[PDB]
Symmetry: C4
Subunit: 251 residues, 4 copies
């Protein structure tokens, strides 16, 4: 009962901790439970189905509190696999990690809330989602690629920003008298910011052929400068994965 | 009459089966007949031209049933080219393939429908389109490239999802009292989901300068995080074709 | 007066013909005259400024007919530089090229129109724009890159098309009774086609939480599959220019 | 007091001038002061909060004039580090640079305005933003990448422009009689230009099944040709940074 003790310790703190193979199954399904619990929290908002959803939602709240209670327990046990955290002092200190203690705090809030309250449960659910990280890996990856392309990006942010201010001002001048949409500069900026991202709600549009004519030039330019940073970062991620691909195919 | 027998067997089960050269002509034109049959099925919906289209549509239904009846026949014959499926047992078992039997089932439904019915014919037409694959090659290609970029993508899905929930909640707080668009959280989420994809129907827009001010920041961020996965996959497909290009230029 | 004869022949049929250096100046400015002539043709449409624009437009029509008359003359003369088309037979046959004869036909139509008419002049102006090519180089380049990526693209066109038909049908079912936007399938297809491209006019939007819920899933998928082919072709052009870059840096 | 004199000269004309490390902190924070001063200039437009913002804005105007006055002073002093501009003649001529003299002119306008006026201060603030460059580096980078891809781009601009004119004309013909949106060609062009960029305000949309049918084809094409140049330039920037990456990893 030692090699089984020690084996299951290894593979469990493989799955619970940094997971490799089929542990992504478990990490996806725990994501599903926290996620669907957040969704039913949204169904609580509709007063026409508030009572029905609330019925099922306390129940799924039951299961979610039980799931993460046991997950907290099980990880603390299978954390014996750490060669630095072993037996007494390890497992008595491992729950002292930063993420772990905030995690137990979020979990205990989950515990009491079942023992104005819904604000608390919506937020703790969100921290389950953000609890997905435990490392900030996503933030690290995004920061790296944003850093590598700082000159190209800042080129796009500067030139796009200028096109916004310019086009908004011109349209404001041409359509300040004959239109009620463009009453003050702040309205012309809302209009510029909402066309250049190609959202185009339709609540403010120019209606004199001068406004149409000036928007039509800075539009053709600006809408393509607001769409660069998505294009630049998209290519950056793909290129970076190709390089990590080959580098890893060797080492 | 053997070498002609055997020649036309080869080139026909080249064209009907895995096609190389001018067989893409035939596969495109059969796609046209199934496609245009689906379109006339849509024209059936307009009651102002329902009768005219329905007139022509039973006729093109005639041709389509005849075409695929003969295609079923001709492929079963020219399937003698299979070195594993030869004469009796092959051609008597080749129609036992999974895709082939579902194909004959869809075809026989086509046969009876010309012998509440229009629901059946719209669906069988759809299965002609999905019958285009016979291999799931498109699904394989998409799955490969989605798999290769799982870390970059999940970075985008996580950070975009957070920006959605955050911006929707802030705008909901700033514009819950002075506006009828944002009545419940579920409305604020519909608004967030429809601006961040830059659809912008225009049915819900913020109208207090607090809502405009908070949307204008998470908008500039979010609309570019919802547009990544198209950008990442787009670069992924192009890069992958370049690598298959060179690799094949050798081997 | 021979070396000057022959020199200016060379550099002129350099500029007029396949241009290298500062001949792009001339080709841009001739593009400006044809272009601005088309624009004033559009100003003719507004009856409030029809007369003013029409005033200036016959005048710029004067200059444009004179410009291209002389260009036709000058190119036919400087075409002596062709080692195959020399003196009598060359310059007497060079105007027999396909593009040249259609060009003289368009020019002569320009001549007579100044000697229901505006339909003719709008069209001939368009053929000046399309006359920019003379080779179909742009069509060749686009066809090459579309050809190279046929498998990735057709993956996107197939999967996007399916998502359209599917989402439109589901939304049609959920919102056929409680809404006047979605009356027939053809309306649901117009709605699907206009959200998935993220145009979003706002004339048709779902208004029952079932329609919002089903659109919100196929939206998140579809809007990113309709945006691939721009992303794929965009990366394709950039990659191809890098390869032609290095290849030419050698040879 | 010489080595301290000379040391701080070096590191200061490192930070103020071409900055390397933590000088980006200072250059970001000076960007914040000019930027937030522009924003409060916009809050001046809303007459409901005009007085409150104007209150705080003269104050932040105080700090901004003092900041750039001292920056002008301090840079002129620490400009002794220039091996060509040293002591008397250098520091007496260094303020004779083009950017420096326009900068002092903008600064002195800032000085007098605190000693119809708001038009002047909004513009000078803008020139602080454009003063960020001092070199046109962003313009240089954009021009380089636009130049490198001139053939692919002009392919996109030509083919997209044709699709615009074509689709707008067809829709104009099909929906000129039965609709008030499309009254003249100029309206059909506004509609075409605003759908093809996927803005889609919603003020003009086709409403006869002929207009819907013709828009639906040139839409599927055009909206993807208007989105190329963002895609091409996006890939161009990313590719170019990868090449500068490796080249610099060597030299
Ligand atoms: C992808 C990460 O987030 C983005 O890079 N997005 C983004 C950021 C800025 C801009 N434009 C410049 C601008 C700056 C300030 C302003 F107040 C207004 C406009 C465009 C985009 N797409
Ligand atoms: C291309 C294949 O499909 C996509 O990757 N598309 C996509 C998927 C998700 C997101 N955002 C995150 C999100 C997640 C859940 C939610 F309920 C709401 C938002 C954005 C896009 N474009
Ligand atoms: C860039 C050159 O043109 C494009 O490749 N564009 C494009 C073509 C098709 C699709 N979707 C599939 C579809 C097919 C048929 C239909 F009737 C409806 C939808 C999307 C885009 N963007
Ligand atoms: C990124 C830098 O700016 C752009 O390249 N943008 C852009 C420029 C033109 C076009 N279309 C062609 C056209 C030309 C003239 C016209 F009067 C109307 C249409 C599309 C885009 N996106």
């Amino acid at each position: 009962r030692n090699a089984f003790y020690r084996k299951l310790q290894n593979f469990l703190y493989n799955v619970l901790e940094r997971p490799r193979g089929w542990a992504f199954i478990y990490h996806a399904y725990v994501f599903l439970l926290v996620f669907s619990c957040l969704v039913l929290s949204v169904f609580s908002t509709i007063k026409e189905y508030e009572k029905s959803s609330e019925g099922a939602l306390y129940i799924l709240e039951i299961v979610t509190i039980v799931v993460f209670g046991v997950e907290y327990f099980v990880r603390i046990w299978a954390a014996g696999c750490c060669c630095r955290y072993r037996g007494w002092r390890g497992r008595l200190k491992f729950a002292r990690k930063p993420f772990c203690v905030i995690d137990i705090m979020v979990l205990i809030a989950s515990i009491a809330v079942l023992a104005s309250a819904l604000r608390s449960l919506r937020f703790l659910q969100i921290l389950r989602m953000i609890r997905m990280d435990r490392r900030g890996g996503t933030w690290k990856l995004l920061g790296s690629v944003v850093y590598a392309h700082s000159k190209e990006l800042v080129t796009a942010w500067y030139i796009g920003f200028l096109c916004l201010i310019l086009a908004s001002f011109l349209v404001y001048l041409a359509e300040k008298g004959e239109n009620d949409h463009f009453d003050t500069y702040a309205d012309a900026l809302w209009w510029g910011l909402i066309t250049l991202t190609t959202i185009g709600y339709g609540d403010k549009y120019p209606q004199t052929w001068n406004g149409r004519l000036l928007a039509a030039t800075f539009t053709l330019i600006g809408v393509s400068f607001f769409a660069l940073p998505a294009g630049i970062l998209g290519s950056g991620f793909a290129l970076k994965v190709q390089e990590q691909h080959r580098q890893k195919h060797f080492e």
